[PDB]
């Protein structure tokens, strides 16, 4: 109960569209219209900076994860190592607020 990372990232999974990968999460940021988009800090830069910039041009909030993609996937469930996740639909999760207020 103190804008927990995890429980509203669950949740947005639970109650909402959540994309998880890399080169797909790009994609939305290239001409999509996500309303929160999250990249592990210890991603690559190719990845972060492409991402970063995509997302911005197009007015996608970016928030970056406090952790690397190591945990990112053991936290959402991808056993890949996910480097980048689009929270496309929130729903009932207001994890936007960590990556939507300024």
């Known amino acids: 109960?103190?804008?927990d990372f995890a429980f509203e990232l669950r949740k947005a999974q639970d109650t909402g569209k959540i994309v998880m990968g890399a080169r797909k999460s790009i994609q939305y940021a290239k001409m999509g219209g996500?309303?929160?988009?999250?990249?592990a800090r210890?991603?690559?830069?190719?990845?972060?900076?492409?991402?970063?910039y995509?997302?911005?041009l197009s007015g996608i909030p970016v928030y970056e994860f406090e952790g690397t993609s190591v945990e990112l996937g053991?936290?959402?469930?991808?056993?890949?190592?996910?480097?980048a996740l689009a929270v496309v639909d929130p729903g009932?999760?207001?994890?936007?607020?960590?990556?939507?207020?300024?």
């Open 1 to 3: 109960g103190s804008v």
């Open 34 to 39: 996500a309303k929160l988009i999250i990249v």
């Open 42 to 52: 210890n991603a690559r830069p190719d990845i972060k900076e492409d991402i970063e």
């Open 54 to 56: 995509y997302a911005r």
């Open 74 to 83: 053991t936290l959402l469930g991808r056993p890949h190592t996910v480097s």
């Open 92 to 102: 009932e999760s207001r994890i936007l607020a960590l990556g939507g207020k300024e």
